[PDB]
């Protein structure tokens, strides 16, 4: 019927111009369409919503072109639209089930691909029009921060963060450049951005800490694009960790000259010297360094007191990592594993067998943090005795064969990932507090006597680039800052200097 | 004309509170005196330099609307002191001032154009740093993409210095100079697209280096995408030289070869007619590139695969040279160790599936090869190899209606392996549920009589899966099969009383529910009310209930 | 026996002129503010955390800010004071 009223259309057209007056074009026109289409509205939604139930392009891009010629006729097209695309972002996301939340790429590639589908499909059939191009907006908005994953970690912050780990995937170790263009995309839709910049601090640190990245590059090109898209500031917070990894690498060549001078180690040292108020780490446990890396501590020691009298330094042990490499053994075996698995593998030279609390005291380690680094060296079938009781005796096996001769025991521990993700998740809400009350104190240092309404909208104008607070949590802040005596109360508040 | 004054007064507090409050009044006033314009340009240039970060953040985004409200001469000054300051030896500085010219560019004109090429032109020449070629040619390309037709003049300026960067040692600066060369292409004159288009064979005529060669392939192939049509004249040229490469032994050459093959393909269709029969020949000799392996070299395989499905999926007139030559690689090759190949391969017979809707008659005769080699993927522990087999099942079925008439047993237990799996996602259930319906509507009833009796448990066990899709999928198949079962325009022998039983139990609860959604319940309806309509003689008390 | 090959470490570099203490207030820096300490315990102690600046200097956040309220220069230099980190 669409292709008949088209036909028909045209043939009016050349009717009305060959063999009737030019007034009647107009007139002609108007009632032609009006017979032919508006008496027909109910019919064409329906078909519509068929059409975009089983793809079919071409259908949506005749209908499109004849609504278009009734006055305020695409309203209901645009609705529909909006919709079906929101349906099915969440019906797409929902057929990932509980696998989609620690998974990142499968959960940022089914937004893309209902993104890219539907997008081609407003570029295509609907000729780029503003209202389709802002109801894919819309859409896409409502279904990316509220859905199923959402739903099962009872917050709309999953979704920020599982862009951040997605990239960081991505950047570990040609078409790179589309996928981040595409996460990128992605990022203009997130109501909570400051989620997703944390954690994409962290990720980076920890990945410039470790120097496990594909290229520098992509870093670059990432850099760029988040220039892009976020502020400044955030910007001159990463090019800081840069700053401070390059001049660590200029401060190690340095040191690196001085020890041929005197007399060499005897193991391969590096250090990565780092500002404690630019980075997200903390400070390590209390351990005791294991005797024979003595030397190299005590002579980086002296070298940055010589360089620098007024620093001191300050080292992580759970951070670092080295080789051991074993003659003990059936053949010749080399292995990669951090300080605390050193500690409790060098222990034991001559001896064989050791108590859990003999153990502790000779290395000085905690007890969760003890028995999480016993637990994966015993899955590395490097160590024999699931539980560990204060009065267990662990002792080394003989003859440990591996298929490699290269060994990684290596591997993140369970607890630490959650332990980390609701720490970073605490920390954002300190911080939104922060910035609340910051806001709160320069918009009254400003306007001496300001109103409440007034005082919430220009707070809310004011952090909407980054989150959208809540009306409790600035009532909340306001009222610790009363207690501060920052601002005075004569419903009106003034500033009290 | 007092407010202004305050403001400017504010602005130097030394305090940041004062100085942040009184920018964002500034913005917002200038959203909403010829003296006063020198003032506020001045304090806008010198708060670029300030010690808080929000500070220059403010100052960035409020340097935006200050061009269309300030004069033509002032904005003259503002892009002279940005592009100056670009070239500074302070980082804050460069980088805060090319985030301004972006700013500035964004919104907005011919005359700062011309002294804001004049300067990117005389940067990027230079190549003793790095940074600032990178930073000028990423702002030529943002200057490019728009209001880029009024630098008619320049072109070959930007050309000359342009093309030199290719040869740089640095890749960045190669691919950004590949993205503004693209740009440039896409609105220019006749003249400078011929000198490009013969500089480029010019130095792919003499291999000065292996390094060069790949970046000049890329550069191609970035023209063929963005120009398109011009590039078609070309192309008697261009092919001889991309054949004579493509047999050189280095990996990562090949691969820029083949892409240059596909985009000339689907950017150029009716120049590259003479040529399609060469490309289609060498990406069937390199579809099947393995040496290391007998039964990293997969790029090679997906770019050709790529390009087969590319060929295919335009040219229309080809179909029986298709099925001649195509069709017996790609169904050899689904039994590919790599899996992301196997997908792109998968990809490429759906839409030569996609194509055929005589070839139906060459694709029957393809059937029985298809059943047999994907019988055998159908055994694969991955769901996504799994779920092509069961899409490509759908769609052959869909283009061809009695296709499987002689390959139900064999193909039936494959679908029946995939529905009861633990390690099967609701993705696998659903796509299967979706190929035996499509299987079922499209067949004889008489073929699945044999196979009822394994048929109707795994159904009846899918209808009772928590997640409501599969639900759906298992009513909307547990209708058909209830139709074929016992046929009412149809004389059939088959006894169909064991399992009236179980359908309708497994009906039955889901029919009465009041909680489960909407789309369960429709199902449900029309379920009932076909097992009525067909079997209803044979129940019992429980039809005045229903 | 173990042999070593290589170590690589991590360390953190901090300024020695405070004696693991804040500046203002002769408390460790772990501890509470001295007007925490003196009141009872409310919605104010529960936010007594570390602040650092850009210039690596680290006081209780109260502190600081009751600092900044008049001045707007760091105790230890005399650089405009920039908070960089919670
Ligand atoms: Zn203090
Ligand atoms: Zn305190
Ligand atoms: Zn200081």
Same mark, same amino acid.
């Given at each position: 019927y669409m292709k008949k009223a088209e036909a028909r259309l045209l043939e009016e057209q050349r009717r009305v111009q060959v063999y009737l007056h030019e007034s009647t074009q107009d007139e002609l026109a108007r009632k032609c369409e009006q017979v032919l289409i508006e008496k027909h509205l109910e019919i064409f939604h329906t078909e519509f919503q068929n059409l975009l139930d089983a793809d079919k392009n071409?259908?949506?891009?005749?209908?499109?072109?004849?609504?278009?010629?009734?006055? &305020? /006729?695409?309203?209901? +097209? $645009?609705?529909?639209?909006?919709?079906?695309?929101?349906?099915? /972002?969440?019906?797409?996301?929902?057929?990932?089930?509980?696998?989609? +939340?620690?998974?990142?790429?499968? =959960?940022?590639?089914?937004?893309?691909?209902?993104?890219? $589908?539907?997008?081609?499909?407003?570029?295509?059939?609907?000729?780029?029009?503003?209202?389709?191009?802002?109801?894919? &907006?819309?859409?896409? /908005?409502?279904?990316?921060?509220n859905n199923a994953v959402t739903k099962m970690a009872?917050?709309?912050?999953?979704?920020?963060?599982?862009?951040?780990?997605?990239?960081?995937?991505? +950047?570990?170790?040609?078409?790179?450049?589309?996928?981040?263009?595409?996460?990128?995309?992605?990022?203009? =839709?997130?109501?909570? $951005?400051?989620?997703?910049? $944390?954690? =994409?601090?962290?990720?980076?640190?920890?990945? +410039?800490?470790?120097?496990?990245?594909?290229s520098d590059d992509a870093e670059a090109s990432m850099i760029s694009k988040l220039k892009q898209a976020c502020g400044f500031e955030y910007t001159s917070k990463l090019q800081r960790m840069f700053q401070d990894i390059g001049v660590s690498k200029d401060l190690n060549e340095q040191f690196k000259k001085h020890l041929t001078n005197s007399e060499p180690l005897d193991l391969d040292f590096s250090i990565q010297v780092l500002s404690s108020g630019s980075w997200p780490f903390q400070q390590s446990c209390t351990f005791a360094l294991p005797s024979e890396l003595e030397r190299s501590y005590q002579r980086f020691t002296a070298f940055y007191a010589s360089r620098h009298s007024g620093r001191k330094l300050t080292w992580l042990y759970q951070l670092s990592k080295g080789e051991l490499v074993t003659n003990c053994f059936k053949n010749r075996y080399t292995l990669q594993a951090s300080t605390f698995q050193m500690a409790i593998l060098l222990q034991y030279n001559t001896e064989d067998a050791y108590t859990v609390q003999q153990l502790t005291d000779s290395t000085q380690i905690k007890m969760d943090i003890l028995a999480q680094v016993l637990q994966i060296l015993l899955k590395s079938k490097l160590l024999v005795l699931v539980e560990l009781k204060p009065d267990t005796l662990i002792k080394l096996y003989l003859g440990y064969k591996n298929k490699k001769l290269r060994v990684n025991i290596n591997v993140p521990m369970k607890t630490e990932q959650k332990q980390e993700q609701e720490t970073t998740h605490k920390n954002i809400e300190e911080d939104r507090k922060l910035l609340i009350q910051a806001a709160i104190v320069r918009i009254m240092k400003m306007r001496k006597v300001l109103k409440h309404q007034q005082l919430l909208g220009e707070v809310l104008t004011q952090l909407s680039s980054r989150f959208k607070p809540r009306v409790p949590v600035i009532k909340k802040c306001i009222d610790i800052l009363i207690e501060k005596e920052y601002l005075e109360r004569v419903d009106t508040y003034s500033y009290l200097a | 004309s007092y407010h202004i004054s305050n403001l400017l007064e504010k602005m130097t507090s030394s305090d940041k509170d004062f100085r942040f409050m009184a920018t964002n009044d500034l913005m917002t006033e200038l959203q909403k005196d010829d003296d006063s314009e020198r003032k506020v340009v001045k304090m806008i240039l010198k708060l670029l330099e300030?010690?808080?970060? @929000? !500070?220059?953040?403010?100052?960035?985004?409020?340097?935006?609307?200050?061009?269309?409200?300030?004069?033509?001469?002032?904005? @003259?000054?503002? !892009?002279?002191?940005?592009?100056?300051?670009?070239?500074?030896?302070?980082?804050?500085?460069?980088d805060i001032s090319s985030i301004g010219l972006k700013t500035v560019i964004g919104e907005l004109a011919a005359n700062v154009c011309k002294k804001i090429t004049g300067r990117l032109t005389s940067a990027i020449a230079k190549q003793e740093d790095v940074s600032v070629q990178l930073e000028a040619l990423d702002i030529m390309a943002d200057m490019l993409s728009r209001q880029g037709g009024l630098l008619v003049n320049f072109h070959p300026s930007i050309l000359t210095c342009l093309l030199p960067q290719l040869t740089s040692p640095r890749l960045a600066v190669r691919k950004r100079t590949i993205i503004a060369l693209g740009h440039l292409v896409m609105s220019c004159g006749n003249i400078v697209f011929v000198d490009l288009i013969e500089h480029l064979l010019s130095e792919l005529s003499k291999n000065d280096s292996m390094s060069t060669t790949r970046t000049y392939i890329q550069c191609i192939a970035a023209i063929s995408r963005q120009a398109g049509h011009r590039i078609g004249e070309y192309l008697e040229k261009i092919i001889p030289l991309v054949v004579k490469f493509c047999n050189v032994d280095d990996d990562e050459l090949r691969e820029y070869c083949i892409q240059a093959f596909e985009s000339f393909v689907r950017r150029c269709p009716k120049e590259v007619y003479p040529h399609v029969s060469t490309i289609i020949n060498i990406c069937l000799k390199y579809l099947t590139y393995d040496p290391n392996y007998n039964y990293m070299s997969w790029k090679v395989r997906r770019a050709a695969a790529k390009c087969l499905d590319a060929v295919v999926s335009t040219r229309h007139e080809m179909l029986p040279e298709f099925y001649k030559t195509v069709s017996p690689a790609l169904i050899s090759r689904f039994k590919e160790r790599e899996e992301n190949v196997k997908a792109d391969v998968f990809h490429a017979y759906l839409s030569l599936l996609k194509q055929t809707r005589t070839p139906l008659t060459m694709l029957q005769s393809q059937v029985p090869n298809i059943v047999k080699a994907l019988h055998k993927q159908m055994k694969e522990k991955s769901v996504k190899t799994r779920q092509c087999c069961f899409n490509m099942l759908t769609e052959l079925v869909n283009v061809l209606p009695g296709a499987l008439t002689q390959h139900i047993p064999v193909l039936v237990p494959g679908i029946i392996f995939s529905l009861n799996d633990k390690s099967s996602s609701s993705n696998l259930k659903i796509d299967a549920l979706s190929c035996l319906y499509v299987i079922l509507c499209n067949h004889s009833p008489q073929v699945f009589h044999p196979h009822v009796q394994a048929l109707v448990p795994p159904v009846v066990a899918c209808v009772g899966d928590p997640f409501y899709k599969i639900t759906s999928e298992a009513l909307l198949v547990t209708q058909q099969l209830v139709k074929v079962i016992r046929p009412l325009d149809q004389p059939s022998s088959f006894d169909a009383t064991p399992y009236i039983k179980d359908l309708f139990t497994c009906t039955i609860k889901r029919l009465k529910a009041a909680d489960i959604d909407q789309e369960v319940k429709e199902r449900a309806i029309s379920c009932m009310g076909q097992i009525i309509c067909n079997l209803g003689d044979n129940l019992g008390s429980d039809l005045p209930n229903t | 026996r173990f042999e070593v090959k290589k170590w690589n470490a991590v360390a953190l570099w *901090?300024?020695?002129?405070?004696?693991?203490?804040? *500046?203002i207030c002769r408390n460790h820096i772990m501890d509470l503010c001295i007007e925490c300490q003196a009141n009872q315990a409310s919605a104010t102690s529960e936010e007594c955390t570390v602040a650092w600046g850009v210039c690596n200097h680290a006081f209780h956040f109260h502190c600081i800010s009751r600092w900044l309220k008049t001045r707007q220069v760091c105790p230890l230099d005399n650089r405009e004071w920039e908070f960089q980190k919670y």
């Open positions: 071409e259908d949506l891009g005749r209908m499109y072109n004849l609504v278009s010629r009734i006055q &305020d /006729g695409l309203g209901e +097209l $645009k609705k529909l639209l909006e919709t079906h695309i929101h349906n099915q /972002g969440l019906a797409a996301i929902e057929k990932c089930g509980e696998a989609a +939340l620690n998974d990142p790429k499968m =959960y940022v590639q089914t937004v893309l691909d209902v993104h890219k $589908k539907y997008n081609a499909l407003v570029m295509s059939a609907f000729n780029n029009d503003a209202g389709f191009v802002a109801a894919l &907006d819309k859409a896409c /908005g409502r279904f990316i921060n009872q917050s709309s912050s999953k979704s920020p963060e599982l862009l951040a780990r997605y990239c960081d995937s991505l +950047l570990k170790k040609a078409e790179l450049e589309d996928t981040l263009n595409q996460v990128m995309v992605v990022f203009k =839709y997130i109501e909570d $951005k400051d989620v997703f910049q $944390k954690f =994409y601090a962290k990720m980076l640190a920890k990945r +410039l800490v470790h120097q496990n990245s594909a | 300030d010690k808080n970060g @929000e !500070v220059q953040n403010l100052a960035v985004k409020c340097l935006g609307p200050l061009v269309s409200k300030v004069k033509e001469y002032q904005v @003259e000054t503002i !892009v002279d002191t940005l592009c100056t300051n670009m070239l500074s030896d302070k980082e804050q500085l460069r | *901090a300024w020695d002129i405070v004696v693991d203490n804040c *500046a």
